[PDB]
Amino acid sequence: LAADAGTFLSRAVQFTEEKLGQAEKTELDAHLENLLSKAECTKIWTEKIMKQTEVLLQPNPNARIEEFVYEKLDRKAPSRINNPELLGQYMIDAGTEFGPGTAYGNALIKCGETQKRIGTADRELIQTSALNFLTPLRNFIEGDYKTIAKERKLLQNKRLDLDAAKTRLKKAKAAETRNSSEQELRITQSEFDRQAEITRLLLEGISSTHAHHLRCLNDFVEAQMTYYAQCYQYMLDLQKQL
Amino acid sequence: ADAGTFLSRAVQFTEEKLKTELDAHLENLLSKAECTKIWTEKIMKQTEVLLQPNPNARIEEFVYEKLDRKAPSRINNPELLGQYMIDAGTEFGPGTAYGNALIKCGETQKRIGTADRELIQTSALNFLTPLRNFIEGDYKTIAKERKLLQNKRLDLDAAKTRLKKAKAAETRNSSEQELRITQSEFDRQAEITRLLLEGISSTHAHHLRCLNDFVEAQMTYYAQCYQYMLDLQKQL
């Protein structure tokens, strides 16, 4: 068990010396370097788009903060009526008060109805998009990315060990000890190579990620089309009655 | 007992804490005007909320309005999303189908944002403005007249008390004369109020035309956005 502490100690000292610039870093194969870089960029942008999308869907930030609170509180956040439907209610009530016979009353009541219909259509889009877009992406970021991160750490650690061994051999004098260090060097190199393959294999899966997301984007688009199309028709209908 | 006297004092204080009825016609008109103001205010506010959902933005506007300095031209959600998509697509590679889609969507999104800005401008220019004008101008006048006639009323009510207490013949005659003077002022003010309370009919007509306009703005915005989406659907 204490030997493990020695491994942690060895990995640390080496990390310090390498940072001190006194020690160098064994550069990884260009292919893996390229693969890791691509996966990262992908995650960064996907995260940004997902967030901005959400903001677009739910403009009120304070509402989002309240949801976060109840989410951490493990409680349900009370539902609220959307602005479009609310306006409709006020208008309809006014129209009624002003008098249904009056044209102004007729117009106000007619509009309030259209507004509520529009509000209903809005919620349809929010649910449709959330179900078809945000979640698919979220999945990828939470699962595959995590796994890759873990493997990255393993390979990073192995490299530290390899570099530490190298440095040890560099300062190896006693023939017998130097030979032992040579055995140690062979030992770490093998393990390092093994993890490198493991990592490359996992990184290969990212290729399909882009194609999967493209489908999700096509869906979101269809949703927006549906939302505006419905609202446009609703508006036309209102003008005919008024 | 003592409790009863304390209760009596309490009732007296309630009286400390807490009328010549006008001709029905005027009363009814007054009620109409008040109702109109209440409903008009509610609709004007909610519709502004519908246009600008973000409360913090409104707060900022209020501060900058008091600051008497122009508030920065913040970018709306659609355009920002478009920017992110376009840049991301560029990074992943323009040739790639995914990148192409991202860029296209960003462009359309920015177009939508511009159309939205147009819609916002039109509504506040041909709808919110007139309504606000009316509530801020005519209503004040109306309120002023109401206060004056209310004072004439209180004075008239006092005159009745003076009349009921006018025991001396001279006192009786003086009270009568003052009551007559108050009455004359009352009917004069009443007439003025009646004139203004007959203008509410015209107000309803102007408001109706304003509403018809707002309807046009919403239809135009929805039409424009629908076409943009059609174009993108064709591009991809």
Q: Measured in whole angstroms, how far is the alpha carbon of residue A237 from the centre of its chain?
A: 41
DSSP code of residue A205: T
Instruction: Map out the domains of chain B as residue ranges.
Output: 36-76+107-235
Q: Measured between alpha carbons, how far is A157 from A196 in angstroms, rounded to an integer?
A: 11
Query: How close B28 gets to chain A, by Cα (Å)?
Result: 13
Q: Which two tokens stand for residue B191?
A: 């007439």
Q: Which of B6, B145, B158, B50 is nearest to A59 (CA)?
A: B50
Task: Check: CB of residue B31 under 8 Å from CB of residue B103.
Answer: no
3-state secondary structure A84-114: HHHHHHHHHHHHHHHCCCCHHHHHHHHHHHH
Q: Tokens for B8?
A: 């009596």
Cα-based distances in Å from A18 to A58, A209, B184 = 47, 35, 102
CA–CA gap between residue B48 and residue B120 (Å, rounded)? 9
Comparing CB atoms, the residue among B47, B88, B229 nearest residue A87 is: B47
B208 close contact with A: CB closer than 8 A: yes
Q: Which two tokens stand for residue B156?
A: 């008239």
Cα gap B158→B152, rounded to integer Å: 10
Amino acid identity of A169? L
What's the CA gap between B148 and B140, in Å, rounded?
12
Which residues from chain A sit within 8 angstroms of residue B55, using beta carbons?
Answer: 60, 62
CA–CA gap between residue A28 and residue A41 (Å, rounded): 19
Considering only CB atoms, which chain B residues are within 8 Å of A232? 219, 222-223, 226
CA A105 to chain centre: 49
Number of C-beta neighbours around residue A234 at 10 A: 19
Q: By C-alpha distance, which of A36, A104, A212 is closest to B204?
A: A104
Strands (E), chain B: none
Query: What six digits make up the tokens of B155?
Result: 């004075």
Alpha-carbon torsion (A101, A105, A107, A113), positive or negative: negative
Resolution in A: 3.6
Residues 187-206 of B with CB under 8 A from A: 204
Q: Which residues of chain A make contact with B225, given a CB cutoff of 8 A?
A: 228
Radius of gyration in angstroms for the set of CA atoms belonging to chain A, rounded to a whole number: 31
Q: State the CB neighbour count (10 A cutoff) for residue B191.
A: 10
Cβ distance of B46 and A97 shorter than 8 Å = no
> Which residue in chain B has the smallest CA separation from A90?
B43
Structure tokens at A178: 């130097």
Question: Given CB atoms, is B234 within the 8 Å cutoff of chain A?
Answer: no
User: At which residue do the structure tokens 């788009």 appear?
Assistant: A49
A101 touches chain B (CB under 8 A): no
Residue A13 forms contact with B (CB below 8 Å): no
Test A56 with B219 for CB contact under 8 angstroms.
no
Report which DSSP code applies to B168: S
**C-beta separation of A206 from A39 below 8 A:** yes
Show the tokens assigned to A117. 């219909």
Q: Which 3 state secondary structure label does DSSP give A242?
A: coil
Nearest to A144, CA basis, from A204, A211, A217, A196: A204
DSSP string, A205-236: THHHHHHHHHHHHHHHHHHHHHHHHHHHHHHH
Query: How was this entry determined?
Result: cryo-EM
The token duo for A201 is 């294999």
Neighbours of A72 (CB within 10 A): 8
Token pair in block for residue A183: 């055995």
Residues with Cβ within 8 Å of residue A182, at least 6 apart in sequence: A169
B228 contact partners, CB below 8 Å, separation of at least 6: B108, B111, B112, B115
B83: buried, middle or exposed (CB in 10 Å: 19+, 13-18, 0-12)? middle
Which residue type occupies A102? T
Taken in order B96, B102, B108, B110, the sign of the CA dihedral is negative
- SS3 per residue for B16-70: HHCCCCCCHHHHHHHHHHHHHHHHHHHHHHHHHHHHCCCHHHHHHHHHHHHHCCC
- Whether residue A126 contacts residue A157, with contact meaning beta carbons closer than 8 Å, is answered with no
| Two tokens, residue B32 | 């109409």
C-alpha A4/C-alpha A1 separation (Å) is: 5
Instruction: Report d(CA B81, CA A59) in Å as an integer.
Output: 13
In A58-172, which residue ranges form alpha helices assigned H by DSSP? 61-73, 83-98, 103-132, 134-142, 144-170
Cβ-contact A132, A223 below 8 angstroms: yes
Q: Which residues of A107-138 are buried (b: 16+ CB within 10 A; e: fewer)?
A: bbbbbbbbbbbbbebbeebeebbeebbbeebe
Question: Could you tell me the CA-to-CA distances from A239 to A174, B215, B224 in Å, in that order?
Answer: 96, 7, 17
The architecture of the domain spanning A2-241 is Up-down Bundle (1.20)
Using the structure block, give the residue that is written with the tokens 């007992």. B1
DSSP code of residue A20: T
Rg (CA), chain B: 31
**Alpha carbons A166 and A212: distance in angstroms, whole number:** 43
CB atoms within 10 A of CB B219: 17
Q: Does A225 touch chain B (CB under 8 A)?
A: yes
Closest residue by Cα to residue B189 from B227, B153, B235:
B153
Element (H, E) at A17: helix A2-19
Note the maximum CA span of chain A.
109
Burial letters for A176-205: b for 16+ Cβ neighbours within 10 Å, e otherwise? eeeeebeebbeebbeebeebbeebbebbee
CA–CA gap between residue A208 and residue A100 (Å, rounded): 60
Q: Which residues of A touch B223 (CB under 8 A)?
A: 232
Crossing angle (nearest 10°) for helices B24-51 and B138-164 = 150
Long-range CB contact pairs, B145-152, < 8 A, 24+: B145/B189, B145/B192, B145/B193, B145/B196, B146/B30, B146/B193, B148/B189, B149/B22, B149/B186, B149/B189, B149/B190, B149/B193, B152/B182, B152/B185, B152/B186, B152/B189
Residue A70 touches partner B, C-beta closer than 8 Å:
no
Across A7-35, b (16+ Cβ under 10 Å) vs e yields: eeebbeebbeebeeeebeeeebeeebeeb
Q: Shortest Cα distance from A196 to chain B (angstroms)?
A: 25
> Distance between CA B112 and CA B118 in Å, rounded?
10
| Residues near B66 by beta carbon (within 8 Å), at least 6 away in sequence | none
Which residues of B are less than 8 Å from A60 in CB distance? Answer: 53-55
Is residue A92 within 8 A of residue A112, CB to CB? The reply is: yes
Q: Contact B103/B34 with Cβ under 8 angstroms?
A: no
Structural fold of domain B36-76+107-235:
Substrate Binding Domain Of Dnak; Chain:A; Domain 2 (1.20.1270)
Compute CA distances B121 → A87, B22, B117, whole Å: 19, 44, 6
For residue B114 the two structure tokens come to: 């511009």
Q: How far is CA B206 from CA A42, A170, B44, B130, B202, in A?
A: 56, 93, 15, 8, 7
How far apart CA A242 and CA B212 sit, in angstroms, is: 8
Tell whether the torsion through CA atoms of A133, A139, A141 and A144 is positive or negative: negative
| Distance from C-alpha of B122 to C-alpha of A91, rounded to nearest angstrom | 20
The answer to whether A11 and A175 are in contact (CB under 8 A) is: no
Report the C-alpha gap between A232 and A225 in whole angstroms: 11
Q: Which residues is chain B interrupted after (C–N above 2.5 Å)?
A: 18
What is the rounded (10 degree) CA torsion for B207, B212, B215, B219?
-160
Kindly state the tokens that stand for A236. 């036309």
**Distance (Å, rounded) from C-alpha A141 to C-alpha A145?**
5
Residues whose CB is less than 8 angstroms from the CB of residue A126 and which lie 6 or more positions away in sequence, other chains included = A57, A58
